[PDB]
Design a protein around this ligand. Structure first.
Ligand SMILES: Nc1nc2c(ncn2[C@@H]2O[C@H](COP(=O)(O)OP(=O)(O)NP(=O)(O)O)[C@@H](O)[C@H]2O)c(=O)[nH]1
Ligand code: MET
Ligand SMILES: [Mg+2]
Length: 409
RNA sequence: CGUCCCUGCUCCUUGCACACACCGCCCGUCACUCCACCCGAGCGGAGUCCGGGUGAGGCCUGAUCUCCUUCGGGAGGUCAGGUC
């Protein structure tokens, strides 16, 4: 399995996906046909091996396969770890899925375009979302250096070295790439091998995991007799799951009784485990996993339990409707082309509460200095007291990050 | 032939929220104004209740130093314990 989850953030079309192509060799598909004409839309996914050419010279020593005869000589590169990416989209309004994604990440790579005016609306928006959430392991990258002057990718490296200054990003190193022709990527591999280090996760902890996809393996027309189970798609964060463990999802499906609303936990067994294209018997944090189940795929078709969280069956997790956020605000709206000042929060207003991987909306009942209580629509399964959350508003038709904080229970 | 349909008109009735007499009256939406008004994210100030803390003076218990005293007592310093 992959050891660690790395984001690829940045502005729209700056080539976040193309840089996941040049490292993994895997494309996100670019799909929905509408993504095949737009660009990446659902969260991409791709894995690879990072060895190291011990018997040669760095950074070109940093391989992708067990093959060192590429650089210096043969001595089959000692394998260091296997990894996995999560490619967020770059378009301004697909803010609500990149946040969602960011509940799973152990580190990131900021893909700035060398041929556009540096602080681009989303490049920043993402960055401060990073600084907010706690993803303190960043590596900036200057992407399209194959279509610019040799003066131009330096003068921008000024602009990056000056923005990256008053912000927390000390020596966050800026490795210029060319995701297109896969030149100077092995030096990006040396960055990610040094700076984005493999954290320790205590396995004895309560099994908890997030979900960001889930799919009907059933092709148009698999017969009933070999109807494989439904498939939940997401990343473990704390613990390790095993093949043939009893499980529950939360908040889980809601019933209908004449206009009423009522969510409830669903139970099932782990039918199968798989990482990449290879099936496993256990699963551990870092990486996005997938869990074959025995529940009706109608329940997990398009991506129905998106935002849900998986835990042990017979575990202790509150399914809140109403919640106490301790919070703070950005002084600006780093997101809009325009930097208009974030107003102070008004009661009886609509806001988009990102908690974990779930992207709920909710209404504000109380407003203190830094303690607000939010009634919701679709519940939230609050697995701990250390639930980072992110707070957006509708400024002008398109949803915008404005404050953050922690969930209190 | 006659009067059905066009049209005008007389007579009788029927209903009207119409009388500038149906080219009448008038209702809601949304658009935007007029006059007075209610809540309210919040800030400043007060009142009260509860639990405790302090608490000056007076009274009682005890003293030391007195001063005075007609030896019955008064005043008083100061200090320990209890009370209003
Ligand atoms: N010349 C040049 N072109 C590039 C480079 N990287 C990507 N491209 C091109 O730019 C286009 C957009 O790439 P893409 O990876 O979708 O950008 P993105 O930011 O990941 N899109 P999304 O917002 O969906 O994640 C592609 O058609 C690709 O061919 C580069 O380094 N040099
Ligand atoms: C994008 S789903 C996450 C990894 C999964 N086991 C496969 O792929
Ligand atoms: Mg992309």
């Amino acid at each position: 399995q992959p050891e660690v989850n790395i984001g690829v953030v940045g502005h729209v079309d700056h080539g976040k996906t193309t840089l996941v192509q040049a490292i993994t060799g895997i494309w996100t598909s670019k799909h929905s046909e509408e993504l095949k004409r737009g660009m990446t839309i659902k969260l991409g996914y791709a894995e690879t091996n990072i060895g190291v050419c011990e018997s040669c010279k760095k950074p070109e020593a940093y391989v992708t396969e067990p093959s060192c005869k590429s650089c210096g000589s043969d001595d089959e590169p000692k394998f260091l770890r296997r990894i996995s990416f999560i490619d967020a989209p770059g378009h301004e309004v697909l803010m609500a899925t990149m946040l969602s994604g960011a509940a799973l990440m152990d580190g990131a790579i900021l893909v700035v375009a060398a041929n556009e005016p540096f602080p681009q609306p989303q490049t920043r928006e993402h960055f401060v979302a990073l600084g907010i959430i706690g993803v303190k392991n960043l590596i900036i990258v200057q992407n399209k250096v194959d279509v610019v002057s040799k003066e131009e990718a330096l003068s921008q490296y000024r602009q990056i070295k000056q923005f990256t200054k008053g912000t927390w990003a000390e020596n966050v190193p800026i490795i210029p790439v060319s995701a297109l022709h896969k030149i100077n990527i092995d030096s990006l591999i040396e960055g990610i091998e040094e700076y984005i280090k493999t954290p320790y996760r205590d396995l004895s902890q309560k099994p908890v995991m997030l979900v960001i996809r889930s799919f009907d393996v059933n092709k148009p027309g698999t017969q009933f007799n070999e109807l494989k189970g439904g498939v939940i798609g997401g990343s473990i964060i704390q613990g390790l799951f095993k093949v043939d463990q009893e499980i529950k999802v939360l908040p889980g499906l809601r019933v209908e009784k004449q206009g009423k609303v009522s969510y409830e936990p669903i139970f099932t067994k782990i039918s199968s485990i798989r990482f990449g294209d290879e099936e496993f018997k256990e699963a551990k944090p870092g990486g996005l996993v997938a869990i074959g189940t025995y529940l009706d795929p109608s329940l997990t078709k398009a991506d129905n339990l998106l935002g849900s969280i998986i835990t042990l069956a017979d575990a202790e997790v509150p399914v809140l409707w109403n919640i106490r956020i301790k919070y703070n605000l950005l002084e600006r709206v780093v997101g809009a082309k325009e930097m208009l000042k974030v107003d102070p929060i008004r009661a009886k207003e609509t806001l988009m509460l990102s908690v974990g991987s779930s992207t709920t909306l909710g209404i504000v009942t109380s407003v203190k200095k830094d303690e607000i209580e939010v009634e919701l629509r679709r519940p939230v399964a609050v697995w701990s007291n250390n639930i980072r959350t992110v707070i957006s508003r509708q400024i002008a038709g398109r949803w915008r990050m404005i404050g953050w904080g922690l969930v209190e229970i």
